[PDB]
Amino acid sequence: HHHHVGTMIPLIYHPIYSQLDLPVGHRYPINKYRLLYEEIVRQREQSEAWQASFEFHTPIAAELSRITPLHDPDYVQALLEGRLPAAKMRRIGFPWSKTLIERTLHSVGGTCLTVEQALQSGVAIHLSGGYHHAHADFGSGFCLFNDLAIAAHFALSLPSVDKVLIIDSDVHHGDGTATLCAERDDIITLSFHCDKNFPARKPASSMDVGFANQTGDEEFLSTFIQVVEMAVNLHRPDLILYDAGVDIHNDDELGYLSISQAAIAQRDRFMLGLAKQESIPIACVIGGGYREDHAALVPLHLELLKAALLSAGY
């Protein structure tokens, strides 16, 4: 820790993240997690800087006591037992399986580990997470349990953390996070999103910033930068949870924004740079992204790690 000149960047990953078997043609790009992992492994083999600056951590599955402070026990139990009503499971958008549940529990564990590591090192990245469409008593939009809200509540149980700011830059409104955190004064929610993307009903975050279809780089970046700087100053958080979803990209198959890969890079560089400048721990999740070829998401997500490498210089 003090042995390192510069900052070591924990990366939290579990092989179960892409182990879920989905039908060909399923909307969800399940293999992106493994593909991103494998790219990072190649980067580490080919670069001393990548090798020296990143280290992998494996999470343990979250215990139920981590999840029921946020989620209704009856909802949780229905999912654990494989008896959630069919229409509600279809709204989540996956077939039920034991592996789905196992994966979700590990990933929730993973976002929590990312918080622990960010507190220790300043910055940590979860190679999954961002399940912002899960509410207390129901799931939706590929989200069963809301890792961001769970991790924020968990963080507040730690001595150093009295205020958490969740900054959600995935193209979709963070509706589940908004409803979960509405009554918690110590968790502030900020969402940037495309108005015409899911969900149609957008319960209020602490602050919501909506964009028109085909919004471009300059508008998006200027707004994101200035709003985030203000939110950090206003709330003085002890921890930032940052959802770096790449479904804002121009070529995303669901999102309606026109953001370039270079602007994704600048977003990430600004966000990580500001956290380091202000000495605020930042726990990142990679969030969404929709491409039929799951590998096409890899370079977009990799920009988050390229940002972290650059900020990780002494």
Ligand SMILES: CCCCCCCCCC(=O)O
């Ligand atoms: C089986 C893994 C599913 C991961 C879900 C990631 C976030 C979905 C919602 C979004 O794109 O806004």
Ligand SMILES: [K+]
């Ligand atoms: K798979």
Ligand SMILES: [K+]
């Ligand atoms: K605390």
Ligand SMILES: [K+]
């Ligand atoms: K969002």
Ligand SMILES: [K+]
């Ligand atoms: K709140």
Ligand SMILES: [K+]
């Ligand atoms: K798009």
Ligand code: NA
């Ligand atoms: Na709220």
Ligand SMILES: [Zn+2]
């Ligand atoms: Zn999204």
